[PDB]
Structures are given as C-alpha cells and as structure tokens.
C-alpha cells in the first residue's frame with residue numbers, strides 16, 4: 001500500500017531534519033573526529049606492526065542524507081537497487097571532520113582502511129570517485145574493503161590484521177562496525193554490548209550519530225527486515241516507550 | 248486538525264526509536280561523558296577560582312523520552328502545560344554515563360551546576376526528587392539554575408562566574424547550552440557557530456545527541472514555533488534535501 005509506504009517514510013522526517021540541518025549534528029561529528037585524533041596520537045602498537053585505523057563509510061565518513069530525502073519525497077522504503085543508483089549518481093557528501101581526520105592519519109604514520117557495506121562489484125567506482133572529489137587522501141583501491149559475500153565486518157578486520165597492521169581504533173555509526181558479536185541481534189543485546197564496553201567509546205570505538213537507519217532498526221523486532229511495510233510500522237510503534245499521562 | 252497533529256508526531260517516531268532502543272545512542276552518551284571526564288581532569292583554572300562544570304539537564308543528564316512517546320501515542324504537539332505534568336510525574340530517567348560523571352566531578356574538586364530550562368517555579372520539586380532517586384550527588388537547591396524569566400542561558404552562566412567559579416566545560420544537547428550567540432537563530436547561523444568552534448567539541452563543549460527537539464527545530468524556519476501544526480509540517484518537509492533520483 002502506498003499509504004503504508006508513506007507513513008513508514010514520514011517517520012524518518014524529524015531525524016532527517018536533525019541530521020541534515022542542525023548545527024548539533026555537525027558538533028557531534030566534530031566531537032567524534034576530535035576524539036579520534038587524540039586516540040590515534042596516543043596509540044602505540046606491537047613491535048613490527050603498522051598502525052591502522054578502520055573506518056566505516058556510510059554515515060561515518062560519507063553523508064548519504066539526500067538518498068533519505070528522496071525516500072521521504074517519494075514514499076520509498078529502502079531498496080538496494082535504488083541505493084546502487086544513488087551511489088552511481090556520485091553526489092555523496094563528506095561527514096564533517098572526516099576528511100581532515102582521514103588525511104591526518106594517513107600523513108602521520110597510519111593508514112585508514114575503509115570497511116564498508118557499499119558493494120564491491122557495483123558500487124566501488126562511484127565510491128572512489130566521490131571520495132577523491134571530496135578530498136580524501138589514500139583512496140587507492142587497496143585501501144577499500146567493500147562488501148563481497150558477507151555483511152558482517154569482522155572477517156575484513158581480520159584481513160587487515162593479516163597484512164601486518166594493528167588496528168588502533170574503529171570509527172562507525174553502527175555497532176556492527178566494531179565487530180560481529182551483536183550482528184543480527186536485537187536491541188537489548190546491542191545495548192548490553194555497549195554497557196560491556198562503556199570505557200571504549202570515544203577512545204578505541206568512535207561513534208557517529210545516525211537516527212535514520214542501521215542495525216538498530218532491524219534490532220527493533222525479530223525478523224524486522226523480512227516484515228512488510230505495515231509490519232515494520234507496527235514494530236516501530238510497538239517499540240515506543242510512553243508515559244501513561246499519569247502521576 | 249487531528250490529522251495534522253498525527254502527521255507531525257509521526258515524524259518523530261524513527262528518531263525516538265533510535266534514542267530509546269539503540270545501543271548506538273547509549274554509545275554516543277558514553278562517548279560524550281568519557282570525553283568530558285578527560286577534559287575535566289585536564290582543566291586548570293585561574294588562581295583563586297573554583298572549578299565548575301555547567302551541565303544542561305533535559306536530554307543531557309535527564310532522559311525524558313517517555314514524554315515524547317506519549318506525544319506519539321496521543322498525537323500531541325509539545326505543550327508546556329503537558330510538560331509540567333510530565334515533570335511532576337517523577338518518571339525521568341538518567342542519560343547513560345551522566346550520574347557517574349556528575350558524581351566524579353563533585354568528588355574531585357569540581358562542582359556541577361545545572362543550567363536548565365525546566366521551570367524554577369513549577370518544575371523544581373520533581374526535578375530534584377528525580378535526580379536524588381537517580382543517584383546524582385550534589386543536588387541541593389543551590390546547584391540549580393532553572394528557568395525564571397529568560398530561556399537564553401548566558402546570564403545564568405555569568406551568575407555562576409560571579410560566585411567565584413571558572414567554568415571549565417559545558418555539557419548539552421542544544422547549541423544554546425554553550426552560550427547565546429545563536430539563540431533564536433536559524434540553522435545556517437547555528438551550523439556556522441559550530442564551524443567557528445570546531446576544535447572545542449569533545450573538549451570544552453560536550454555534545455549529547457537529541458533528534459527529537461531543540462533549537463534546531465525552531466531553526467528550520469523563521470517563526471517556526473509560532474506556526475500552526477500544518478505550518479510546522481510544511482517547514483520540516485521544505486527543509487528536506489533530496490536526491491532528484493537522477494545521475
């Protein structure tokens with residue numbers, strides 16, 4: 001139903017306004033990247049290791065909010081085929097602070113590797129073109145670990161380590177950017193992971209804000225991503241914790 | 248129109264799910280408070296000054312998300328009279344990391360002052376009761392600078408300084424928690440303020456995420472808060488930046 005598609009996408013509007021328009025969102029991005037630089041400068045690695053930083057791309061270093069805007073305007077639930085066209089459109093923006101941090105790491109005895117679920121086979125060319133245009137240094141193909149057969153990222157982290165790197169910090173907007181332990185899990189387990197790692201945030205796990213999509217969306221209900229539009233609407237509304245209006 | 252009230256509040260749903268349910272939101276809160284502790288420990292003040300930390304309350308140290316949930320369920324635009332009842336309900340929660348940071352400052356030669364737009368005359372009793380219950384130390388009345396006649400906060404910051412304190416850092420979810428220079432201004436000016444202070448974030452200005460309300464909402468359009476429901480809906484949708492769907 002077009003009506004359901006409309007309601008589902010309307011639910012994203014206020015968070016999208018916040019991400020696209022607010023100074024507060026920018027401040028959170030700068031806060032993250034300022035903290036990331038401190039962590040990078042402090043980091044020491046094992047003898048014989050090279051210093052690596054692992055960075056997510058979407059909503060961490062690259063800003064895809066215009067795709068979300070298109071979803072709102074056209075009542076379009078997420079579809080990977082539309083996403084591929086968005087990537088090919090080569091209109092990605094940079095998250096504030098990301099280029100400066102990236103280029104600083106790469107010029108100060110580190111290497112940023114991009115571990116991202118943009119698709120290696122169909123989305124790599126647009127990604128690399130946009131990143132060059134946006135001012136990122138170090139965007140030769142070998143810096144990229146785009147999605148091949150698995151959305152979970154831990155195996156790609158391991159590939160980087162096998163190449164003689166020690167990963168000194170991770171940057172992401174999704175907890176699945178820090179490992180696999182809550183991949184595909186519901187939000188209670190994901191909150192628990194965060195509590196179990198409280199001291200790492202702003203140090204070795206650097207968070208960017210994303211109120212629009214992610215593992216937390218699937219985390220709203222068992223089988224969320226396989227539900228139809230009406231089911232996803234219901235899952236979102238059922239997750240709401242509300243005051244009963246009483247004292 | 249009930250229909251417009253419904254649409255307006257539906258637009259908050261996804262961001263509310265993110266704030267209420269996601270581990271990512273918790274991680275951002277921990278990141279902020281971890282950074283705040285580092286900044287506090289590093290801070291040195293002028294000879295003869297006492298160390299103060301200024302903290303916002305709502306969506307910085309106190310979590311009022313159930314009020315937002317009630318808005319969604321009842322199609323209720325924000326109303327200060329409803330807000331006062333929410334405060335009186337004494338069901339506020341704590342933002343993750345806030346109590347620990349607060350109590351650490353207060354036991355390590357600092358004092359946290361709460362500069363907040365909860366209302367001094369009608370909302371103070373519930374605020375203090377909730378904070379005691381939530382585990383905050385240092386919540387005697389004199390630690391509080393609740394709203395009296397002005398929503399802008401700079402004058403209250405000045406009161407704190409007049410009492411012999413040097414403010415070493417500010418914690419907030421709203422740029423207006425850092426001063427008055429973009430109070431009542433639109434989002435372009437607010438983004439500019441952030442760019443002009445890029446290096447302060449995560450150091451002397453500590454940001455918490457709030458995708459649900461704030462100065463950025465009013466910042467969406469001239470006279471936003473005076474518009475009717477339909478006008479606010481239009482302002483939000485008009486602010487959306489969308490991909491045109493082309494290459």
Ligand SMILES: Nc1ncnc2c1ncn2[C@@H]1O[C@H](COP(=O)(O)O)[C@@H](O)[C@H]1O
Nearest residue numbers: 056057058059078083116117118213214
């Ligand atoms: N709104 C959305 N809902 C679900 N998946 C999305 C959405 N937007 C993007 N994606 C996918 O998630 C990936 C995230 O990539 P990254 O954050 O770099 O790992 C994208 O490349 C898309 O395949």
Ligand SMILES: Nc1ncnc2c1ncn2[C@@H]1O[C@H](COP(=O)(O)O)[C@@H](O)[C@H]1O
Nearest residue numbers: 303304305306325330363364365460461
């Ligand atoms: N959704 C909302 N829209 C506008 N104002 C709000 C909303 N929720 C709360 N407020 C007001 O903003 C104040 C924020 O307080 P604080 O963040 O502590 O300065 C609250 O005490 C309310 O008076």
Ligand SMILES: [Mg+2]
Nearest residue numbers: 056058059173
């Ligand atoms: Mg991402």
Ligand SMILES: [Mg+2]
Nearest residue numbers: 303305306420
């Ligand atoms: Mg606040």
